[PDB]
């Protein structure tokens, strides 16, 4: 419209922004793994590498519980899903690149949602 639309701040405007975003990131194919937490072991030495495994599920669920009271909180979690994906999963394993794929989309989401601030 004509408002700020670049600085959410409020834990509500954020929560659901981040809620709809996470939704969209998750909606974004590339966020197919981050969606649900990994088996920690079915995963080829994943938890052995991934000292920081976050999943969009826990994200929107934490976000649900009203944990995304901060724009970046949301991020550290989403950004995190991407991190672990890039941490172990190769950029050719369809996993990592996915991180980068959605993370890109996700990037347009946040910046659009005035979230992202780097």
């Amino acid at each position: 419209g004509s408002h700020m639309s670049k600085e959410p701040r409020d834990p509500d405007q954020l929560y659901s922004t981040l809620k709809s975003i996470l939704q969209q990131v998750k909606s974004h194919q590339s966020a197919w793994p981050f969606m649900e937490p990994v088996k920690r072991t079915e995963a080829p030495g994943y938890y052995e590498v991934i000292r920081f495994p976050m999943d969009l599920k826990t994200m929107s669920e934490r976000l649900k519980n009203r944990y995304y009271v901060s724009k970046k909180l949301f991020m550290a979690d989403l950004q995190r899903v991407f991190t672990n994906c890039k941490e172990y999963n190769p950029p050719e394993s369809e996993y990592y690149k996915c991180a980068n794929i959605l993370e890109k989309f996700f990037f347009s989401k946040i910046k659009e949602a005035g979230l992202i601030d780097k």
């Binding site: 197919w32 969606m35 649900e36 937490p37 990994v38 080829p44 050719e92």
Partner: peptide, 15 residues
């Protein structure tokens, strides 16, 4: 338990 994930994880074919 009884989770239906999609992360193939186990090396088999992802690209």
């Amino acid at each position: 338990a009884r989770t239906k994930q999609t992360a193939r994880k186990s090396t088999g074919g992802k690209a």
